[PDB]
A paper describes a structure:
M-phase phosphoprotein 8 (MPP8) was initially identified to be a component of the RanBPM-containing large protein complex, and has recently been shown to bind to methylated H3K9 both in vivo and in vitro. MPP8 binding to methylated H3K9 is suggested to recruit the H3K9 methyltransferases GLP and ESET, and DNA methyltransferase 3A to the promoter of the E-cadherin gene, mediating the E-cadherin gene silencing and promote tumor cell motility and invasion. MPP8 contains a chromodomain in its N-terminus, which is used to bind the methylated H3K9.
In the free form, the hMPP8 chromodomain consists of a twisted anti-parallel β-sheet formed by three β-strands (named β2–β4), and α helix (named αA) located at the C-terminal end packing against one edge of the β-sheet next to β2. Specifically, Asp66, Met67, Thr69, Gly71 and Gly72 of β2 strand form hydrogen bond with Gly72', Gly71', Thr69', Met67' and Asp66' of β2' strand from the opposite subunit, respectively. The dimer interface has a buried surface area of about 1025 Å2, which is strong enough to form a stable dimer. Sequence alignment result indicates that hMPP8 chromodomain is more similar to HP1 choromodomain and lacks the residues in dPlycomb chromodomain for dimerization. To determine the oligomerization state of hMPP8 chromodomain in solution, size exclusion experiment was performed. The size of hMPP8 chromodomain in solution is corresponding to dimer, consistent with the observation in crystal structure.
Author numbering: 0 to 60
Amino acid sequence: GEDVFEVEKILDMKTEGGKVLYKVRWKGYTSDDDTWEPEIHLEDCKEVLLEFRKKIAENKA
């Protein structure tokens, strides 16, 4: 009941009136299934966050 779905990775982020959302790729699903999630859903996904921060840093320089 606890692991029905898994985040593969954060694809991108946004704010909407200052509040953070993440666009999520669900492991085992296609890009048609991607969703926007509020930050509080991902805030504790440490590895997922590290990987997204790395992708930000890499696209910076």
